[PDB]
Design a protein around this ligand. Structure first.
Ligand SMILES: O=C(O)Cc1cccc(NS(=O)(=O)c2cccc(Cl)c2O)c1
Length: 358
């Protein structure tokens, strides 16, 4: 890699790993289109396995960017419309609060206060039906944003219903395979378990627990190489040969809602470039990111703006991830760690690296 990339990456990540006590970390920088990879530390402390470019990390909420693109692809295929009522795809959702809640509201956390977590008590799809039937919105649709796995998770499950495919099968055949994400998984196969890092929470090795809508909201595991390819695919969608996937990527980067200086896409979140770092750094703290905020509708949504900082943070119990890119500069970064450390430390590190390279 160009020494300037090496210099900025090492000077930024080495102190981060020390301050945050991160067992293992992988970073990719995309710079003038090409990827540069960096790895530190341990995927498995007990078995002394190092992090490599083939290590699988839990992406957590970065999985929502795949869900948003997969939904976008279903729109481009004509299988669904974001303007469709939720009840078009789940007719048993007869409770009156669902009148007026569309797939767009589900995809963008604006249905009216669907909760962050699906309750652990919910297992079967009849448990899920009961949960959504009994849920009482705090707000009218399209008035406030509350980040929610129960919101975008339901969007992902419903968006693939016309295809007849399971969510995992739609994701594999329509997103992973066309993009050659051949080491990206919803369920890690036995053959790849040797590469699956452990997460670390309070010093204990942990993996993500099963839960309802987990595949749709936080289910993806991936390598730093596949994630750099994911970023390149989102940086330059028009290089993608499959036409509905190309349009689906663009739909996921459209600006549907505004709160503060942040715009909500499908999975992705965006700010105007150039950004105020304090705005994305403080804004990524869960005290802001997970809070209830009024939104202004973008009527009609703005198509993907090249002069944007596009990003997503992600966590599981044992992992912390971050992806960001600037299409106008052909610049991007992926940070994958097997410890869940504070979001503002992630964004600060990413800002320092990308600002130095732009
Ligand atoms: O480890 C597990 O068993 C479950 C688990 C724990 C913690 C986070 C997640 N991922 S989440 O629900 O999607 C999410 C929620 C809020 C913020 C972020 Cl950044 C995020 O990723 C999943």
């Amino acid at each position: 890699a160009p020494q300037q990339i090496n210099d900025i990456v090492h000077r930024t990540i080495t102190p981060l790993i020390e301050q945050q006590k991160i067992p293992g970390m992988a970073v990719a920088v995309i710079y003038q289109g090409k990827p540069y990879y960096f790895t530190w530390g341990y995927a498995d402390i007990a078995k002394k396995q190092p992090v490599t470019q083939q290590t699988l990390f839990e992406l957590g909420s970065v999985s929502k960017t795949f869900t948003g693109v997969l939904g976008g692809d279903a729109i481009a295929r004509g299988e669904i419309k974001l303007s469709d009522p939720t009840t078009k795809y789940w007719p048993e959702l007869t409770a009156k609060q669902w009148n007026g809640i569309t797939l767009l509201h589900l995809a963008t956390y604006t249905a009216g206060g669907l909760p962050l977590q699906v309750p652990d008590e919910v297992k079967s799809s009849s448990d899920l039906l009961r949960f959504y039937q009994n849920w009482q919105p705090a707000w009218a649709p399209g008035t406030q944003r509350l980040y929610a796995n129960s919101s975008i998770g339901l969007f992902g499950a419903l968006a693939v219903k016309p295809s007849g495919l399971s969510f995992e099968q739609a994701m594999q055949t329509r997103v992973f395979q066309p993009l050659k994400l051949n080491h990206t998984w919803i369920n890690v196969p036995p053959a790849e378990e040797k590469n699956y890092a452990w997460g670390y929470r309070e010093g204990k090795a942990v993996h993500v627990s099963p839960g309802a809508l987990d595949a749709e909201a936080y289910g993806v595991k991936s390598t730093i190489e596949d994630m750099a390819r994911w970023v390149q695919s989102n940086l330059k969608p028009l290089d993608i040969n499959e036409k509905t996937l190309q349009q689906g990527i663009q739909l996921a980067q459209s600006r549907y809602w505004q709160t503060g200086d942040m715009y909500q896409g499908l999975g992705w979140e965006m700010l105007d470039w150039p950004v105020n770092p304090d705005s994305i750094i403080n804004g990524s703290d869960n005290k802001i990111a997970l809070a209830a905020r009024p939104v202004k509708a973008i009527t009609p949504p703005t198509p993907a703006v090249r002069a944007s900082w596009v990003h997503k943070t992600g966590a599981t119990g044992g992992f912390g991830s971050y992806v960001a890119f600037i299409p106008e500069k052909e610049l991007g970064i992926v940070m994958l760690a097997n410890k869940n450390y504070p979001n503002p430390a992630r964004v600060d590190a990413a800002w320092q690296i990308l600002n130095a390279l732009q």
